[PDB]
């Protein structure tokens, strides 16, 4: 099915001749390596509404109202308002069946979008808390859902998992999450922190234990523009010794951090639309990915939470092309960096490079 663009062919495409719908056929055929996407918040509008109606969760609400009430598609005030609506959305984590269904839906849609390498991340405590589910059984449902789809797809998309410890919901427990990550070392390729952006320095020992056991780190940092300084970024880099940074857009505010990230070969996982919708960037026109890219910082393109925003990865490419003048060449380059920085087994990484790059 998917006829992926090859580096050789990029000179033959003239995007300026195409309508938006048309450019979408081009974005889909970019062989995409996506590093930053929350599985637990990865769904289409049709899937989300089906889940609400399945459990008769909002019988007083029309479809439009459900989406408005639960999601962030029209954006909101801050990372802070985001966390509060994420909590409502956990209304869908009703049982292990819907969770396995979600994993299947999410993998299948990434495949249809032209994603070839997909690292999903999820927070066990976030999925479990609402209906007090068992995290072992949650993780089994997700694993089984993923394996079913990839095998059905004759492994045309390669998928791995990262574990998230988080801050912001009632059952949040970073240590529990790290222990769980290590117990399932076999399934998890990385460990992350999300939710409220805190300075993770105070969890140094937990992150050192994870990292030293052989599980690399990529934490959310340098996202929230309401924080008074860049302490969280310094801690991620110097204390947690991360290999990648979720967002990292505030690196753009500091010449010293730009130098440090280049010097340390750290990649920033940029989620452009997420940044605009949470007001961490004024507009796509002024998004720091442009400045970061031009300064020599390694960056990749990510969707973050397709369910909360009601977008998919190809929306992010469209925005980058349209508002910030990125080229097909840039996109192939960012995707190869992302493959290079991926936490997946290197044999798998070799195949993908052979196949697409
Ligand atoms: C404490 S609830 C917020 C939850 O939603 C997750 N999250 C989803 N999208 C993002 C999240 N966390 C932090 N920054 C905003 C965005 O990247 C986070 O991992 C956490 O699991
Ligand atoms: Zn994220």
């Amino acid at each position: 099915p998917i006829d992926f663009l090859k580096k050789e062919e990029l000179k033959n495409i003239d995007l300026s001749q195409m309508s938006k719908k048309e450019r979408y056929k081009i974005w889909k055929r970019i062989p995409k390596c996506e590093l930053h996407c929350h599985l637990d918040l990865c769904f289409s509008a049709d899937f989300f509404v089906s889940c609400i109606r399945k459990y008769n969760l909002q019988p007083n609400l029309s479809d439009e109202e459900v989406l408005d009430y639960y999601l962030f598609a029209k954006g909101g005030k801050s990372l802070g308002e985001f966390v509060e609506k994420a909590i409502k959305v956990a209304d869908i984590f009703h049982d292990y069946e819907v969770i396995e269904d979600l994993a299947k839906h999410a993998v299948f849609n990434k495949y249809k979008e032209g994603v070839v390498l997909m690292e999903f991340r999820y927070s066990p405590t976030f999925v479990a808390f609402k209906y007090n589910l068992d995290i072992e059984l949650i993780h089994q449902a997700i694993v089984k859902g993923i394996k079913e789809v990839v095998e059905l797809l004759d492994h045309k998309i390669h998928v791995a998992l990262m574990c998230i410890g988080d801050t912001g919901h009632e059952a949040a427990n970073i240590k529990a999450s790290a222990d769980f990550c290590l117990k399932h070392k076999a399934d998890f390729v990385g460990f992350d922190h999300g939710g409220h952006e805190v300075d993770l320095k105070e969890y140094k020992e937990i992150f050192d234990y994870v990292r030293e056991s052989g599980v690399p780190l990529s934490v959310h940092a340098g996202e929230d523009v309401t924080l008074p300084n860049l302490n969280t970024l310094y801690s991620a880099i110097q204390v947690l010794k991360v290999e990648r940074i979720g967002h990292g857009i505030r690196v753009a505010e500091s010449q010293e951090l730009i130098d440090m990230v280049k010097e340390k070969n750290i990649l920033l996982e940029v989620c452009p639309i997420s940044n605009v919708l949470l007001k961490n960037a004024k507009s796509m026109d002024t998004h720091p990915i442009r400045q970061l890219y031009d300064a020599g910082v390694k960056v990749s393109v990510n969707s973050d939470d397709p369910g909360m925003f009601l977008t998919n990865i190809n929306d992010d490419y469209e925005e980058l092309y349209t508002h910030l003048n990125f080229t097909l060449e840039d996109f192939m380059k960012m995707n190869e960096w992302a493959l290079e920085k991926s936490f997946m087994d290197s044999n798998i990484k070799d195949k993908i490079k052979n196949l697409y790059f």
Side-chain angles (χ1 to χ4, degrees):
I2 306 205
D3 171 44
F4 289 113
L5 293 168
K6 286 280 164 302
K7 293 172 174 185
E8 309 77 298
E9 305 180 297
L10 306 177
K11 50 159 153 63
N12 298 331
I13 302 152
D14 177 6
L15 289 172
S16 71
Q17 310 281 320
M18 309 186 89
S19 70
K20 180 199 274 178
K21 256 211 161 208
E22 291 199 85
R23 292 192 303 265
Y24 275 78
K25 284 193 90 195
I26 299 299
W27 308 145
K28 168 186 180 201
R29 304 160 58 202
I30 291 172
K32 288 170 295 288
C33 298
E34 174 167 33
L35 297 176
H36 191 126
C37 186
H38 297 257
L39 173 54
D40 33 16
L41 292 185
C42 189
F43 47 73
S44 60
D46 278 355
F47 188 90
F48 181 78
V49 170
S50 286
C51 291
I52 300 305
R53 306 311 188 199
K54 187 183 177 197
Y55 302 109
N56 317 100
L57 285 161
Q58 293 298 338
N60 282 336
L61 296 182
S62 80
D63 299 357
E64 184 175 355
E65 280 178 299
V66 173
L67 296 185
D68 249 41
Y69 180 76
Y70 282 103
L71 309 178
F72 223 68
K74 288 162 200 157
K77 268 192 153 98
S78 63
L79 173 54
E81 198 187 348
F82 178 87
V83 168
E84 287 302 295
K85 299 198 97 182
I87 298 179
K88 296 179 198 271
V89 168
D91 279 1
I92 64 158
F93 300 142
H94 192 272
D95 53 71
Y96 307 98
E97 217 136 67
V98 64
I99 290 162
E100 182 182 345
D101 279 347
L102 183 173
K104 290 178 188 180
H105 161 88
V107 172
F108 183 65
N109 283 288
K110 289 303 184 170
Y111 160 85
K112 305 212 295 181
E113 274 132 21
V115 167
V116 303
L117 188 167
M118 181 74 227
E119 307 188 357
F120 271 127
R121 57 186 68 187
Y122 86 98
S123 171
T125 67
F126 173 59
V127 170
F129 90 89
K130 195 67 153 258
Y131 293 84
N132 288 287
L133 303 183
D134 186 341
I135 55 182
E136 288 288 334
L137 297 183
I138 288 166
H139 178 78
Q140 287 181 28
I142 288 169
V143 166
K144 160 174 195 281
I146 293 168
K147 300 185 64 187
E148 260 185 63
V149 180
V150 308
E151 292 180 330
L152 183 85
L153 252 24
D154 191 30
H155 303 266
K156 306 277 146 267
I157 184 178
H158 283 97
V159 179
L161 283 166
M162 298 184 37
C163 183
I164 307 185
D166 52 21
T167 298
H169 62 87
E170 281 305 304
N173 190 323
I174 294 157
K175 181 192 169 30
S177 306
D179 289 343
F180 190 76
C181 185
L182 296 176
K183 169 174 182 193
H184 300 287
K185 208 173 186 276
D187 301 315
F188 287 119
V189 296
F191 189 62
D192 178 25
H193 170 276
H196 296 152
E197 193 173 318
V198 294
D199 181 350
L200 299 163
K201 202 209 284 98
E202 65 177 53
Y203 308 107
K204 175 171 195 298
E205 297 301 311
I206 297 179
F207 290 98
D208 288 346
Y209 192 43
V210 171
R211 199 177 61 257
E212 281 156 21
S213 302
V215 179
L217 312 173
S218 170
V219 298
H220 286 58
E223 179 180 13
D224 189 350
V225 294
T226 74
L227 299 190
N229 51 53
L230 308 184
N231 282 3
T232 57
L233 283 169
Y234 281 96
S235 288
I237 297 177
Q238 293 178 321
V239 181
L240 279 62
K241 294 153 187 75
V242 303
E243 290 255 278
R244 315 190 314 241
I245 292 170
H247 305 288
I249 55 171
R250 302 190 68 187
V251 164
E253 296 166 41
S254 166
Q255 188 62 227
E256 177 163 77
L257 281 176
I258 295 173
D259 290 335
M260 291 173 48
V261 306
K262 292 161 72 174
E263 237 258 24
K264 296 181 179 276
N265 197 43
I266 292 173
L267 175 135
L268 313 176
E269 304 158 355
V270 185
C271 307
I273 284 181
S274 175
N275 294 157
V276 180
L277 289 177
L278 285 43
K279 306 263 207 296
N280 294 307
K282 328 197 198 308
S283 48
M284 203 56 78
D285 277 338
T286 51
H287 195 279
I289 186 173
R290 175 35 85 182
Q291 177 191 344
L292 286 162
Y293 183 72
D294 295 337
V297 175
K298 286 181 168 158
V299 301
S300 76
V301 190
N302 305 266
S303 55
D304 206 359
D305 308 275
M308 293 301 280
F309 308 133
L310 295 183
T311 48
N312 71 93
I313 188 70
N314 289 316
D315 296 306
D316 294 81
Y317 286 92
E318 168 72 15
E319 300 291 313
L320 290 183
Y321 167 85
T322 286
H323 290 280
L324 283 179
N325 305 128
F326 278 79
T327 70
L328 284 163
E329 282 80 11
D330 302 328
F331 298 146
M332 279 280 313
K333 172 173 330 197
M334 292 189 285
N335 279 295
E336 201 168 353
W337 285 340
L339 162 73
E340 283 157 8
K341 294 288 294 177
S342 170
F343 295 153
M344 288 205 192
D345 180 288
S346 73
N347 301 315
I348 299 133
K349 289 213 286 188
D350 294 329
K351 293 209 235 303
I352 283 128
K353 199 215 170 175
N354 291 322
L355 269 13
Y356 309 103
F357 288 100

